[PDB]
Design a protein around this ligand. Structure first.
Ligand SMILES: CC(C)(COP(=O)(O)OP(=O)(O)OC[C@H]1O[C@@H](n2cnc3c(N)ncnc32)[C@@H](O)[C@@H]1OP(=O)(O)O)[C@@H](O)C(=O)NCCC(=O)NCCS
Ligand SMILES: CC(C)(COP(=O)(O)OP(=O)(O)OC[C@H]1O[C@@H](n2cnc3c(N)ncnc32)[C@@H](O)[C@H]1OP(=O)(O)O)[C@@H](O)C(=O)NCCC(=O)NCCS
Ligand SMILES: CC(C)(COP(=O)(O)OP(=O)(O)OC[C@H]1O[C@@H](n2cnc3c(N)ncnc32)[C@H](O)[C@@H]1OP(=O)(O)O)[C@@H](O)C(=O)NCCC(=O)NCCS
Ligand SMILES: CC(C)(COP(=O)(O)OP(=O)(O)OC[C@H]1O[C@H](n2cnc3c(N)ncnc32)[C@@H](O)[C@@H]1OP(=O)(O)O)[C@@H](O)C(=O)NCCC(=O)NCCS
Ligand SMILES: [Cl-]
Ligand SMILES: [K+]
Ligand code: NA
Lengths: 389, 389, 389, 389
């Protein structure tokens, strides 16, 4: 019933990098405009914008609405944001699909956006501090990256998974270098061009056009990777090199019914066949994609062997490894263009980011059946199955 | 099709009052346990928790999940939060309904939660401040209450509406006093007892049980109301007395199919027959409820005259007056137990809070057809139609 | 040769009390006017104002200039502040004396002022905080009360003195009670009436005359004293009850040669016959007064027995007892009207504050030779000998 | 009878440059050790260290005693800071001279130190902030650079003087260019080598040695000067180019009796023949050096024409010209190696910084009489006369 008419994403910016001072909703507005243009659909026609966003503090009322309004979506339309952590960008898409499935809207723009760079530090001060030092809390770390039940970083959950799965530092680094090497090759061959829409960072002393993923290392070496220190555990195995990055970006999709696309003469990027979300132990959250992907497949009536292409989000080499090992899908069809270790990981946006990557590679290679999945802090996974028209 | 098996709310707390240092997820956890207990449904049976929440900064990863885990919802379930401003707690319920209608879940807990007291001040400090003072932003004011497009308070949107609809200060005050007087009578008669679940405020030198709405003023006088100064515009008409408050609380509902409740022998509080959300001009966001309620009724196939009871959220006397004038429903059936001017207005929670009040009043008086609606910052409304079974 | 024509001091306020919102320089201005008025000297005759002050953060350029100008001292005069911690208030008078003695000035106003209540929290943010929590530092504690070499509170240095002089908890409670009793006694006997000059705390909702030492607790008994738990060590001896308080206040003296006073027909509160500052171990900083006292005494060619009146700052019961035991002077002429434990310890002003008490008490009882001394954090002491004329 | 036995200063750092993260007392300790070494005096011989410093917030108890201790001065000695704003560094030396003059001390180290980089932002937060944004105040701007009575920047007092004296933009620019060219020439020709002691910036990623003033622009031209826009007044004359800079550094002098130096075989840098400080209207604070220099010269018995060399702090091209214009001393003997416009102006150290430049230049050219002077925010001036031996 529901198709993805069009998709777009910004380049992913490095932490305090190209988009260091760019509010998330500015990134979202550009991707909203882009999917409308790519589909031949006027902003006037949008019913609702649904944007995942984990870190909106200090951005002002409902950044999803600010994005939609900046893109010229009409005031009569609606907008909201949601948060299921790193599952957000993809969940928003399944949520958008449900609005159409129940007959409550016809045209939805859904995805995610995140500025981890603009995330502020904070403190509750209404009571006052009579005496003594107090903490200014980094919201990115606190609200984005720390498990609320165990008090440790997502990177520690990665350690937990490495131990349970017995994944050596050497195995994790090999994975990491492959991801970098795949992404470099894809960037250089122009495989990210179709999906990226440029973003203009307005500057008094010059406007800069950002249209490439700046986090991707060129010529990353295993030796330099092997050299790194463990980032979360002195005798750990997870490093800055084999973990995903802290990043900025947005990414979205334009949804409507298959019949509606047909009337408009649009050739959709894909049909949404199923999605699923399941929970797992917070301590091993990186394992979420396993039950999530298996449920999505079952809902699709598909076998793992039926898939032609897969984007499994690389939160950490440790967890991506475990996911691939348990699901057992051919690794040669997974993250064919590199993943988050190389490309970066703007949390609320990431699920829509890999959806864009999946859809455009499926189109270019003629892949019929695909799946995107991500792990979720606090212990969850989300997955979505996509079939080509 | 989808019914509300059961519902519950905490007392609504005064700003920096009874829940001054209570994080929202703790209020949510209590309300999740209550809906479960009231339906006879075990926590193990819940598929997903969905909580509207506008101000989660500093609380940690995905407070919805924290609330759910604290209530004993199993790790295999999921949880997410969402943000459609004051519409959130009600939109969360419509979203929960869609999970079931599309066959993606069987049992949902849905509502909202908010601690405006615990909302922090923040600043973006990653780039440093080379020189010059800078602002520590109040997230409640900034992210909750300020219009992102015009830069003025929701109270200014209320002024715009009062000007446009030509509602005197005296008229707004009379509405305000009536709200207070209806709320006091309802409290004293015990009409809020069904819907409220007590919350134990843990204290080092004494736990305190909060089970009454503390913001409700006893013996409110028109003369005291009339002596207040305009709170947003020196020659304005909107005052602290005829505006909603800044408050804390949570409220939820347990959702399942009609056939599911029947299998379980559950007598539902009601059937969700339609909902709607529509946009309007940010400048007069308080008019949100007009097109939303009309759309909801049309979808329900109901005339305005078909309604037996209505809860229209009182963000400001000014806009609540405008809403009633335009829709023309019998004002004697609207907020019969008072509303937000008296009871309070914890943003994320408010939509579920008025849903609770509607359901328990509908049950108590044998009302067949109900509607709940709220205005939303940035120019939106949401409304839901409920029929008794 | 150099005399103190006149002296005055504010009442000493409790922490976040009478002066919770009053900037030190306002308190300075009141005291400057009082010494002029009391000596019958025009402000235009002041060459320079010198004010000790440890916690100026946030008050604007050179608070001593601000105080001087508010007090009426014309623009032609000069002003500056100085910091020798708790010695400041007294040191400033020594410095003032030195201006005249070298023939560089004729008339000085010198003393100290401090608002520990108005001391702000701070952080260095120019380079930015890239990631992670940081601390907002209480300047009162950091710059005021923490030893910069060992990193602990002045309370620990007193604990240090407690264990070296083997002073028992009860032996410090005894000292604490007797100070309180004496303080209450002088107060009710009206012995602080002369030195004190009232301060008017302006206000929107009222004006308040502050003319009483509010930190003095009346009816002090040993019972409550010995029921306090240690303040700096889980099983130490120093407590809130036997250490000085946190307080606001200002105090000052008017200086000029003995000839000048004569020409103006002024009867001086006394003559400064010597002064001294010496250093000691930072760990046992409370001992400071021992060497500075002997130095000043030796410089004046007096013996300890020559003294008729002594003011020895009560930073802590521990250090005060230690100094009194080491010096061997008669415990019945020391802090006759009680000390800082009962009166308050406004760091920057304390040395001038105790100088006032000394001066007015000497005059009242007909004492000939007098001494004021204070210990200083970082390991220093300062002392001054005063003779009646 | 007081002589400057020796002197030293760090290189002056650019704002957030070489010493971006270097606490003032560290620079202070280096300069203290240096003057000890240069004079051949043992640290254990130092009675007191006196350091001017305007922005100490968050550096802990009495940064001056920190410097003295780190520098190796024994706990037995004393130390304190003082604030006469821009004149602090030179006033310190005059105060140390008085210590010896009155026989209270034999050997003093006096000067000043400032880290405008490390100055923090602050907020008074003890009462708490119930709601609303609040200001985090830049202490550098607030306590250092803003007139407490008029609320505007020193740059505005500068305009006042410029308009008062009718000094054209071009004129101020011509002065700016000279000061840079003079400093560049002095730097390259080795003229700063004597006075500067190198400072080692300790660093994880390596140590860096700083021994050159990094703020001096090489090849400054009238062309570049002209292109700059007004820094404070939209139709003003003062720009970043003809105004002094924000900077870090420290400077000091070892003081002793002339007979003591002769006992030691020391050939002092000069004899302090007089000093003076005077007030003026804060609005035109930049005029301060006029009365100060004239009073100093009068106290010295010197005609203006007796001077062989002059250091007159270049707070602004505006006030500098004015001062020079009034006094009428030969311009070719004024700031011969450049001034603060090029070298930098580390507030509390500045007066000791220009004292170093003067002393060392007086020696290499055989100058007999010299004068140093600076303006002071809040409307004061200070000056000192030096005579070679
Ligand atoms: C004047 C002042 C406000 C400007 O501060 P600032 O703008 O942060 O410093 P900058 O040098 O970066 O000024 C901006 C620009 O002018 C420049 N500039 C300054 N002098 C220049 C020159 N002689 N030639 C060419 N460019 C010059 C640039 O370096 C610069 O360009 P950029 O912004 O692209 O980097 C500041 O230095 C100050 O307040 N000075 C006075 C301090 C004081 O009052 N002390 C006490 C007085 S008694
Ligand atoms: C000692 C010190 C740490 C305590 O400050 P504080 O504990 O925050 O002050 P409080 O308002 O909390 O009062 C302290 C507590 O003991 C009490 N108390 C203190 N003296 C008491 C007495 N004489 N009798 C009965 N109770 C007493 C209580 O009032 C109690 O608070 P409560 O109401 O919760 O029971 C503080 O005053 C200080 O730092 N003193 C030293 C200052 C200094 O070092 N200056 C320079 C010296 S070199
Ligand atoms: C309206 C608002 C600004 C007022 O906040 P506030 O004035 O700071 O809070 P208060 O309740 O303490 O009001 C202050 C005063 O009016 C009084 N007051 C309020 N209602 C009164 C009444 N019905 N009768 C008599 N006095 C009343 C107080 O008791 C009080 O007296 P005081 O100043 O001597 O203490 C604030 O509640 C607000 O922002 N509400 C709107 C929130 C909103 O927009 N939500 C979403 C909309 S889509
Ligand atoms: C792991 C993490 C803490 C590190 O961030 P960071 O400390 O800023 O690391 P950086 O990118 O600045 O790089 C650090 C060092 O290793 C680097 N490095 C990183 N990858 C490298 C590589 N592949 N090869 C060589 N060096 C590499 C260096 O550039 C650097 O050295 P230097 O800066 O001292 O000169 C951070 O990226 C993070 O938290 N990632 C996980 C986020 C996450 O949990 N998201 C969601 C999961 S559900
Ligand atoms: Cl979101
Ligand atoms: K959000
Ligand atoms: Na010093």
């Amino acid at each position: 019933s529901i198709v993805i008419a069009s998709a777009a994403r910004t380049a992913v910016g490095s932490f305090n990098g190209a988009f260091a001072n760019t509010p998330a909703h500015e990134l979202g507005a550009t991707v909203i405009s882009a999917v409308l243009e790519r589909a031949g659909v006027a902003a006037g026609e949008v019913n609702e914008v649904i944007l995942g966003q984990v870190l909106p503090a200090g951005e002002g009322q409902n950044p999803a609405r600010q994005a939609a309004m900046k893109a010229g979506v009409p005031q009569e339309a609606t907008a909201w944001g949601m948060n299921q952590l790193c599952g957000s960008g993809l969940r928003a898409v399944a949520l958008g699909m449900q609005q159409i499935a129940t007959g409550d809207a016809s045209i939805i723009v859904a995805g995610g956006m995140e500025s981890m760079s603009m995330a502020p530090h904070c403190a509750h001060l209404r009571g006052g501090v009579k005496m003594g030092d107090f903490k200014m809390i980094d919201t990115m770390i606190k609200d984005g990256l720390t498990d609320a039940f165990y008090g440790y970083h997502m990177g520690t959950t990665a350690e937990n998974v490495a131990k349970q799965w017995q994944l050596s530092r050497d195995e994790q680094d090999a994975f990491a270098v492959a991801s970098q090497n795949k992404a470099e090759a894809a960037q250089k061959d122009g495989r990210f061009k179709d999906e990226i829409v440029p973003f203009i960072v307005k500057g008094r002393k010059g406007d800069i056009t950002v249209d490439a993923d700046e986090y991707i290392r060129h010529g990353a070496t295993l030796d330099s990777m092997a050299k790194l220190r463990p980032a979360f555990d002195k005798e750990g195995t997870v490093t800055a090199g084999n973990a995903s990055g802290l990043n900025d970006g947005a990414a979205a999709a334009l949804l409507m019914s298959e019949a509606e696309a047909s009337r408009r003469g649009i050739q959709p990027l894909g049909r949404i066949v199923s999605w699923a979300t399941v929970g797992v132990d917070p301590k091993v959250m990186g394992t979420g994609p396993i039950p999530a992907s298996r449920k999505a497949l079952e809902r699709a009536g598909w076998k793992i062997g039926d898939l032609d292409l897969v984007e499994a989000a690389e939160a950490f080499a440790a967890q991506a490894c475990a996911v691939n090992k348990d699901l057992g899908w051919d690794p040669s069809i997974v993250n064919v263009n590199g993943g988050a270790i190389a490309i970066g990981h703007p949390i609320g946006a990431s699920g829509a980011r890999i959806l864009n990557t999946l859809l455009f590679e499926m189109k270019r290679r003629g892949a019929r059946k695909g799946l995107a999945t991500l792990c979720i802090g606090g212990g969850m996974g989300v997955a979505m199955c996509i079939e080509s028209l």
